[PDB]
Write a protein that binds this ligand. Structure first.
Ligand code: D10
Ligand code: D10
Lengths: 4, 1023, 214, 107, 107, 107, 70, 4
């Protein structure tokens, strides 16, 4: 999961 | 062996600074030093009062310094006293709740968000009666507050940003100034970040790295006449502080002085100060991991980088004789175990025999290992690296042999047949270099003939492969049993329980063993033939659900089920997922429960011993045949022993390696890493505490000049976190009694959204708090402290309203009331938008792009989406990843209606916004928040109002932690917007209309951002 | 309300969105709690439902709940002192295992509202010696005194308040294919929550429908 | 089994004829099954140069709005990883040109 | 718990106990706790009625009998010295109390 | 009422169960609410008690009336200088020594 | 509010002693004082080595100071 | 549910  | 000095403050000849988490004082005159305060926890900031007598100190507590509060120090009598009981939330990057400065009268002004809905609202407060009362300055969020010639000087977001050098985003530190006893003007707004401002004479001295490195500068009280004073090159300067004459600061671990007049920089001499016991004792359970069952009913587990072979009891323990960093331990024989040892160079396979002692460690590098296993006959091992390769390592020679390499993700899910002939594993794939999803097909590798076969097709997600004892059929799970489950709030459907087990007989002609096909009616006993085996695949008659493991047994099958549940706790608190071990009897086709409250499970190689961890954190072990007979696995019997300096070096190198290995751009990585290594490695030996290491590590992470380089977790102290008693209220000292200045409440009928006093049918606002649990609070009794001492319990509170109205209720003293304040705010803004738009505009606010965001968006989206206009306030948005999902919603356009015989129209689509939309955004919205903002404009859903946003669109997905539990993050996923490239990173998003929120706007109690938005929509809604 | 003696029906309230089929009557025959479907606009995409309570004495309607979600299954306790009901307000997303999406699967939770201001949540087990109930009926702004009952979120369809326990009808998450094409009934299970022990248990499973005596 | 056979046949057909540059998806109805079939292939066919959303013989239902909302997504960015392939944004975005097939048996 | 002592069961399933010289009326859970409003040195706490508890308060002068009602609040403390009390009890009808001192007297 | 039983087990914990259904016992928790006090108020209290017991229990009442009355104030003035339990110990032990007898210990 | 000083040791102008369980050092010359060691538990004896450089300290631990080491 |  590519949290930002 | 010198220390790491830092964050100093000056006053005359005396100079206070931090060393080893404790506060020290140094006298230039005599040249002596002494520790003036200690054992309070971790201290990072100390400020001299005007008279130079007392000192305000900010100290952190909690294993990860997740909490903080302020203390006073009287150098006259040596008195120490806690001032605030806010238990402010803080992280490495945002250490909120600190000293803002001192007013002309010599009073302390603090900056905290304790009573605010958003962490970034670090509003200013004046401290009175040593923490008794708090008077707000209503100047908006601030980090520093200075005074000059009767003029307030406000520093916004002016704290240091070591983790992001060269930051030029919208949240960059800026300085404002008063000009008309209430009017404010922004005076320092450079392209880069401005930190730690001070005023000597009539010039503001601060720090910035506009020239490519941190240096000191200054400008008149008008932001004019810029001047570059220092010219450092070794380490960025930090924490500027003055007394009116000279400026003090720290650099590379030393304390320096700068004289504004002479303009001379000089280093203060301090030498050695403290060198604590290097040999430390730790608790294995606190850092344990990788627990595995061995033969003879033994156990293997890893902790703080060390490995052990012990009995369930934990009485007989053996440490594996290997230097630091053992990543994995795996049963490799009767008395032999295989392990994975990691070094700065990489990961290597090893083997140890806890009986004899022989521990021949290999040297063939395997890259970054994330999965390891050994066959049941200790011949070879299977390994998965971050190169996306799966390989077999000869446990005798050491020669690794790559079997297959995926180009999408790691091959961590694999199993070996009991006869050591086949290797089944999940192979992540894509049918296009840009597909939105990644499929996974089970692959089977044959040691004989050395050839790979397709056990499954590549159209979904097939996993958890597992062979049966006799190695005749391959079992596995897949999410192919599609069947939608309805959403109870939003018109939507999701695949909740679509998991089901399947089997594949390795011998063509043989039927599904679970089908119970009479032997007399079949003719098995053919011969292995893995060709087109995916065609012979068959399911096993078990209701669809959410399975994570399948274990084939003699006449039954064990299945690990995970009941549907929310993901809030898991997303924010990292809370483990809850499963339950189920059993399916092939004969009776009936299912039963073997063990519940499981959060993890491991199974022996012999399939006779089960090891599991329950929701209580403990580890248990029980025989599969008699699951009722479980024992608790104890490990805290033998103290864990290590050396601070050996561990600190190890930890630095790993942090340095991950940062390099995970940076999104490999090229930039090779250069930055090689250029910052030694420079920061030389500071490690000066570190004595986890906090010292943090300073070094964070500064080195900042060398990548990118967003998302964070440092979370880790053990920094044995002090318990600070407690704060809350009842969702605001107190004010009026005379000798505290009055309920405000009683927060959002949606009365929702859960946890109002002051617990409301349950007694009375709005506390206005009432006078007499006493709590017998003790009288007021003028001479800190209510904040009393409440703190009752946090998490129920106390009797005597109240008093208008007339002779007196209440005496048992109130629940909560540990926190942030959410209640957030919901209160949202509802207030919502009510506001309705009244001002004469009931023609809706309101929705998105706190972040995570589970909570998703929650809040839909919580109001269902009542506000059908107004003439909509305001999608996304200010303070903390990022996440679900922006795309929210946009997809707003993207819907109403193109029809349903006319019923009875009732009202039904808009099509349902999730369509009725009219004009408008977004509000500030500098406190970033990451996914950044993406959402750019997208909103890019797709033309409406106008964007506010201020440039944060600017950090390089995502992360940590997958490895430090031996002390520390979880470091590395910008690994650079976002590329079409027709803009990576432009958003280190910049943010520009709103179509810029509406600043000056300090004077806060003083007038007006929100210029939400007002403009409303007024602007009314204009568009004239058509 | 139709007078079972004369036959004269008397309209209490009329919704303009959907039927008011979910209602309950207090044991003392004084209050009538029911789900009132509403909208905040003649074109809203969703229909909210707020529980309303009607008092036979004074003949006046009160708002037991706010109009921001779906509140249902109202039910009074024997002594007719508190009103219990369920609501889909416990928002918390559940991940989709195939498609990048999230859905509100288990966001159902029970709540209670004492009809006498000052009285606490009966399930909170607040010592009588430490409270001063015995006030008097006052349904005004009762939606402010609302309080939840400490029971894990799920998919509840009924709540029955008993002496020292509460019965709850749970419906485990499941697909809708069979129900959509075969009209297949939904599967539930009768659960019991002991106020004292705060522990839950199963009373009866494989239920597809349930009715309870007066 | 015959329906799935047909869909897969048409799917294999569309690949071969478009030299592997076009995707295929078929929606039998706008009910639960439709939702099932649409996503069953939507996850493997949405990232081709072109997409064919065959909705012939569609028996109706009510979830059309949900499927449209999906196809309505336009690809406007990507995620560049240190290792692995690009991640399209949004994820449920069709990569290129779309084309629908419909007969008199869809209502 | 580190300084607790004199744990005693009351009515309504309540508990009374002394610690570090302080007294408390709480539920088994320890969630609802009330401190007896009395200065330092409470030697003993004893059930003396539905919501009333009798206590023994000690000072430099000696030990004195007291009474507290955790419901209302009335806490009238006596002044008649009893010497050094080592045992205290109350009848079931809250009329009187029995006390034993180091003078070897029962009263 | 003879209906409630309260007990402590060899594990130090306190439990409570109905006499009719002794199988239904709960654990009495008390460490939920922090215990609050003042070092200087407690230290004075403790000194006076130590000073009183020393006087009240000395084998010879006569010698007691004199030694006590002659050492009280002298050692009481040191209590306010004490900040730690160890500081108090020093004061108390020295005052116990004023009885010039054996067996005056502090454990 | 002064402290309770006790168990001192001397060496030249420097003078170590115990205050608040911790060890302190005082310089008759300058007249200043400082805590040279703390957080080790309860200290009751500190002795100057011959050279006056190092110091041997006896510290007690355990709830009732039932244990000790140097 | 408004089937069509
Ligand atoms: C073994 C690698 C673990 C990776 C951490 C979580 C990755 C999830 C992708 C959303
Ligand atoms: C009592 C009315 C029953 C209505 C049949 C199903 C209606 C569902 C709306 C989707």
């Amino acid at each position: 999961r590519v949290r930002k | 062996m010198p220390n790491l000095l830092l964050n100093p403050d000056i006053h005359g000849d005396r100079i206070i600074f931090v060393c080893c988490d404790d506060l020290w004082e140094h006298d230039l005159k005599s040249g002596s030093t002494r520790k003036i305060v200690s054992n309070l926890g971790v201290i990072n900031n100390a400020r001299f009062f005007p008279d130079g007598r007392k000192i305000a100190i900010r100290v952190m507590r909690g294993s990860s310094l997740n909490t903080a509060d302020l203390y006073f120090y009287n150098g006259e009598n040596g008195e120490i006293k806690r001032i605030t009981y806010f238990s402010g939330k803080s992280t490495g990057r945002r250490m909120f709740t600190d000293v803002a400065g001192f007013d002309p009268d010599g009073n302390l002004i603090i900056s905290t968000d304790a009573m605010q809905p958003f962490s970034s609202m670090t509003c200013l407060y004046r401290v009175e009666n040593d923490g008794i009362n708090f008077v707000p300055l209503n100047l908006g969020p601030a980090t520093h507050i200075l005074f000059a010639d009767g003029r307030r000087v406000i520093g916004r977001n002016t704290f240091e940003l070591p983790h992001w050098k060269g930051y030029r985003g919208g949240t960059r530190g800026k300085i404002w100034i008063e000009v008309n006893s209430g009017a404010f003007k922004k005076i320092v707004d450079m392209s880069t970040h401005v930190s730690s401002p001070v005023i000597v004479g009539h010039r503001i001295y601060f720090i910035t790295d506009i020239d490519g490195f941190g240096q000191i500068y200054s400008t008149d009280l008008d932001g004019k006449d810029l001047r570059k004073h220092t010219s450092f090159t070794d380490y960025y300067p930090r924490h500027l502080n003055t007394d009116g004459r000279r400026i003090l600061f720290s650099k590379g671990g030393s304390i320096y002085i700068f004289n504004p007049d002479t303009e001379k920089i000089e280093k203060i001499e301090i030498g050695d100060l403290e060198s604590p016991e290097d040999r430390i004792i730790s608790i294995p359970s606190k850092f344990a991991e990788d627990f595995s069952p061995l033969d003879g009913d033994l156990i293997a587990f890893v902790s703080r980088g060390q490995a052990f072979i012990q009995d369930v009891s934990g009485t007989y323990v053996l440490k594996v004789p290997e230097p630091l960093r053992i990543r994995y331990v795996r049963r490799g024989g009767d008395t032999k175990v295989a392990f994975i040892h990691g070094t700065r160079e990489g990961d290597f396979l090893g083997i140890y025999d806890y009986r004899t002692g022989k521990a021949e460690k290999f040297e063939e590098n395997l890259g970054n290992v994330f999965a390891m296993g050994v066959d049941r006959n200790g011949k070879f091992a299977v390994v998965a690296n971050d190169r996306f390769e799966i390989m077999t390592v000869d446990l005798e020679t050491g020669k690794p042999t790559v079997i297959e390499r995926s180009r999408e993700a790691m091959i961590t899910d694999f199993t070996i047949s009991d006869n050591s002939r086949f290797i089944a594993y999940g192979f992540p794939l894509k049918h296009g270099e840009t597909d939105g999803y990644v499929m996974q097909a089970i692959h089977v590798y044959d040691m004989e003939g050395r050839k790979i076969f397709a056990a499954t097709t590549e159209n979904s997600h097939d996993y958890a492969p597992a062979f049966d004892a006799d190695s005749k059929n391959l079992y596995y799970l897949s999410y192919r049993s599609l069947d939608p489950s309805p959403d109870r709030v939003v018109l939507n459907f999701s695949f909740e329980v679509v998991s089901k087990p399947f089997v594949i007989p390795l011998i063509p002609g043989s039927p599904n063993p679970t089908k119970l096909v009479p032997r007399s009616m079949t003719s098995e006993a053919g011969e292995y033939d893995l060709n087109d085996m995916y065609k012979r695949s068959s399911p096993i008659n078990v209701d669809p659900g959410d399975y994570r493991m399948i274990i084939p047994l003699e006449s039954s099958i064990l299945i690990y089920s995970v009941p549907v549940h929310g993901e809030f706790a898991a997303y924010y608190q990292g809370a483990p997922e809850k499963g339950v071990l189920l059993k399916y009897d092939v004969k009776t086709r009936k299912v039963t429960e073997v063990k519940n409250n499981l959060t993890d499970l491991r199974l022996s190689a012999d399939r006779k011993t089960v090891m599991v961890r329950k929701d209580d954190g403990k580890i248990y072990t029980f025989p599969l045949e008699k699951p009722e007979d479980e024992r608790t696995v104890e490990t805290d019997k033998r103290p864990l022993v290590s050396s601070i300096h050996e561990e600190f070096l190890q930890m630095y190198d790993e942090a340095w390696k991950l940062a390099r290995d995970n940076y999104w751009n490999e090229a930039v990585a090779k250069e930055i890493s090689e250029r910052i290594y030694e420079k920061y490695r030389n500071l490690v030996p000066l570190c004595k505490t986890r906090y010292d290491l943090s300073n070094v590590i964070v500064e080195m992470q900042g060398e990548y000049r990118t967003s998302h380089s964070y440092e979370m977790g880790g053990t920094f102290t044995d002090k318990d976190p600070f407690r704060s008693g809350r009842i969702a209220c605001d107190f004010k000292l009026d005379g000798d009694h505290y009055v309920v200045a405000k009683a927060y409440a959002g949606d009365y009928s929702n859960e946890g959204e109002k002051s617990p006093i409301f349950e007694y049918g009375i709005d506390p606002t206005g009432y006078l708090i007499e006493d709590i649990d017998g003790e009288t609070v007021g003028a001479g009794s800190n209510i904040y402290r009393v409440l703190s001492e009752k946090a998490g319990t129920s106390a009797r509170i005597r109240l008093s309203g208008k007339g002779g109205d007196k209440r005496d209720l048992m109130i629940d003293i909560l540990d926190d009331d942030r959410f209640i304040r957030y919901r209160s705010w949202v509802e207030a803004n919502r009510r506001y938008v309705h009244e001002r738009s004469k009931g023609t505009i809706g309101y929705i606010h998105i706190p972040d792009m995570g589970m909570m965001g998703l929650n809040e968006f839909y919580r109001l989206f269902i009542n506000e989406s059908s107004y003439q206009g909509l305001i999608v306030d996304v200010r303070f948005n903390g990022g996440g990843f679900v922006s795309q999902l929210i946009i997809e919603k707003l993207m819907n356009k109403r193109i029809g209606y349903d006319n019923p015989r009875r009732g009202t129209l039904s808009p099509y689509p349902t999730n369509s916004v009725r009219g004009k939309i408008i977004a509000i955004t500030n500098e406190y919205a970033g990451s996914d928040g950044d993406i959402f903002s750019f997208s909103f404009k890019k797709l033309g859903l409406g106008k964007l109002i506010g201020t440039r946003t944060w600017g950090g669109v390089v995502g992360i997905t940590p997958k490895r932690r430090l031996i002390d539990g520390t979880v470091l993050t590395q910008p690994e996923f650079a976002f590329w917007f079409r027709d803009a490239g990576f432009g958003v990173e280190n910049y943010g998003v520009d709103p179509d209309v810029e509406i600043e929120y000056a300090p004077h706007d806060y003083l007038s109690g007006k929100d210029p951002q939400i007002d403009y938005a409303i007024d602007a929509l009314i204009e568009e809604l004239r058509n």
